[PDB]
Enzyme design. Sequence first.
Site, PDB file in Angstrom:
ATOM      1  N   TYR B  17       0.736  -1.252  -0.095  1.00 17.31           N
ATOM      2  CA  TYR B  17      -0.026   0.045  -0.047  1.00 17.31           C
ATOM      3  C   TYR B  17       0.766   1.379   0.104  1.00 17.31           C
ATOM      4  CZ  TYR B  17      -4.145  -2.709   1.028  1.00 17.31           C
ATOM      5  OH  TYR B  17      -5.325  -3.789   1.065  1.00 17.31           O
ATOM      6  N   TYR B 144     -11.954  -5.443   8.847  1.00 20.33           N
ATOM      7  CA  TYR B 144     -10.860  -5.848   7.836  1.00 20.33           C
ATOM      8  C   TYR B 144     -10.600  -7.328   7.662  1.00 20.33           C
ATOM      9  CZ  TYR B 144      -6.625  -6.402   5.191  1.00 20.33           C
ATOM     10  OH  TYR B 144      -5.579  -6.778   4.263  1.00 20.33           O
ATOM     11  N   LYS B 273      -1.307 -15.051  10.919  1.00 20.43           N
ATOM     12  CA  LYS B 273      -0.227 -14.285  11.600  1.00 20.43           C
ATOM     13  C   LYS B 273       0.680 -14.967  12.618  1.00 20.43           C
ATOM     14  CE  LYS B 273      -2.049  -9.542  10.224  1.00 20.43           C
ATOM     15  NZ  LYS B 273      -3.260 -10.216   9.337  1.00 20.43           N
TER      16      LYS B 273
END
Lengths: 428, 428
Positions: B17, B144, B273
Amino acid sequence: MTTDDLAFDQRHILHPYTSMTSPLPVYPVVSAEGCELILSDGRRLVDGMSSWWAAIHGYNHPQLNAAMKSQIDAMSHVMFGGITHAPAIELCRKLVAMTPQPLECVFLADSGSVAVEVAMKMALQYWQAKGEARQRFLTFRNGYHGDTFGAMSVCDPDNSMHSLWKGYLPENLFAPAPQSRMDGEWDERDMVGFARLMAAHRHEIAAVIIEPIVQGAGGMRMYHPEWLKRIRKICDREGILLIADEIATGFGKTGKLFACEHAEIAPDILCLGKALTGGTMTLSATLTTREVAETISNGEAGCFMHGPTFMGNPLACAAANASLAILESGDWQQQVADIEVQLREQLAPARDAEMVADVRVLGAIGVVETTHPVNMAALQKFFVEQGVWIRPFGKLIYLMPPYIILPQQLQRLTAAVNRAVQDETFFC
Amino acid sequence: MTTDDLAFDQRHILHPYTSMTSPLPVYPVVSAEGCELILSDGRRLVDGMSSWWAAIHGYNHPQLNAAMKSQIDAMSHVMFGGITHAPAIELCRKLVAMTPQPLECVFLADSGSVAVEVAMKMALQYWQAKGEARQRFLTFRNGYHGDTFGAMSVCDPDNSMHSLWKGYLPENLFAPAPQSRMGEWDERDMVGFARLMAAHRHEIAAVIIEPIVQGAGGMRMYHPEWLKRIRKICDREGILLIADEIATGFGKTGKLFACEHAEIAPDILCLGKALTGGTMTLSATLTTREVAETISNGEAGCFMHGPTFMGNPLACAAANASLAILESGDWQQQVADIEVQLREQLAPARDAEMVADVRVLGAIGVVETTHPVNMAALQKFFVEQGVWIRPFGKLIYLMPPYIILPQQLQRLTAAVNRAVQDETFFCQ
Ligand code: NA
Ligand code: NA
């Protein structure tokens, strides 16, 4: 591994595209070395699949091992947000240098499907930035680009059972599968379907997406390079982006480094995975042109809107780097060349077996297409008993062995395929 | 790393991003050890990010290291189609054991977004198999769930700039962001959600949310009563509940899984993660027997997904070693002590002019600012203070490794307080 271990796997562990109420047997692997897989009980198998086209240097390769361990001593992972590191830089260096000139911007990611999603998002953001209402993709039937939502929207609708998601997936344009063979002659009739679609939707097409030369999971099809030439030029004339999905074909598999080389063309967007890391762990890359990367960054969003948590993973980049280094020697060309001759020669006889519909070979890819579907459990057991690892699917028995395979090992593989198709024992 | 290496990175390598026309500085890391990153110039930085919430035991952990190297000696990868192996069996046993009772079927994947893609596909295939026209997802604003197309369709439309893809993305239902804070409960908070449920209950395939902590959509921390009510509404209507715990999973909010805070069990659970201890990418989607069985009994005969590196042995060995460290139970008091130090040491930010709000939960400390941060200037400031902190938009937040030393955490909280005293590092 105990049998209690195996019972747990059956009851609680999903495997790729396979029933949970009616699962078929899975074989326990404990280790691998050279071109062999070693089962829990000690049986050694010659690998004919390269773990789905990824393990091009085999298993427990000294150079891959040393690279991975040295990277672990440095750091296995660090985030890529505001940070860069040697393994990523060296990898991207090699990727830019080894692909056509205009492909000089690299977006690393974690899996092939994600690399495809990236390409698609790159195409949509590109046109959005240019102010043009282009949101449709033109693809071929029998294509396969991944399992995520976007990737699924350009997969063969019948092969992938799009009826399951009818109303949820976007409906794209599907040209007919290419008919002309890589072995044979070009037929211009092949183009009419594609031309009719282009003429009707030219104004709304964001990109054309295809697998160059070889359509993998959608039928192990091998089509004529003239197709890529034609497509490239049409995309050029119309201003439409061309995405080449080389997740399966990349890194020497069809005889050339990248299958696009067979047509002497360059796509605007290039997707890579599988053999990128020498099949040690997951990693992917999507390459594009300066024109695309910059146009996106200049639009409303100010950047390309994507960025996975493990983007640029050092361990995987180091493995990839070591894999590419093995390839820089150029030895793969002779190895693949030789494997291609041995595959043509040794599968040729299968053309006469009654259960066989077609035999095609390209580079280190050898395919026997059958007239009826295989009996998965029985055929799998048969291959294991022959001391080989071959994983068939539908009507396709195919081989894609590591480049370091010995002629004696390859011969064991071809012998096993030929024996499997000699009657209907393992079919339906 | 030479200067030419760095230049190559700037012009040819995309990062998450961020602009390729106006690229911002990146810092070259050579290695990492303990809770520190080591730059090319020798500088050591205390890591406040854990490489985006994954490296919960720090870097160069000897146990993580030995487990990875050992597995490399056996085999770093073998395909999962028709094959199983110890590292995956051992990981699935732990995942099943440590999660709520009904969650007993595991689908391993490579990245978090894919895990979500998998969850959404499970819900759709489930209803399809039951013959019900259900294709809507009901979610919260500010959520998200990943960067791939299906995941994107449940991300916050404003935060994720859905206008960019208007017409390509399916349109889902977005209930108001949960107001009640992790704080007193207000019944009026439910009106929205209830309105949507009433008008679309017949059409909703699943409710998907991040439990307790909404991460990337705003580092928001809401009341556990919401999960209780949502579980009850889903039970009543017969709708599936997906809990995306890719960020909250494995201890981060002070409980092993954030769903614990409400003593609730979802029908589908997404993990990523910290699953591998932040060494390399891996993910997991768990669901119930009801879901997995129903899907396998529908027209497809299986759950329709299967990535190439599914069940990667090296990644599975890493996750096993990471889960073994957590088994000791030391993380509980480690996280509790970090929560106390964050609360105590971030308190002062409440006297700063650039601050909008301060909130802490478990190992997560967030300072929300009034204005967007100046990325290049603030990032360099932190590096100069010997810390690695990666802010974004209006959020400066900390999620350090559980093994961080109190003097290291102090260096991080001190740097945050310093950064928010005036406008220097704000806007751009
Ligand atoms: Na290039
Ligand atoms: Na469980």
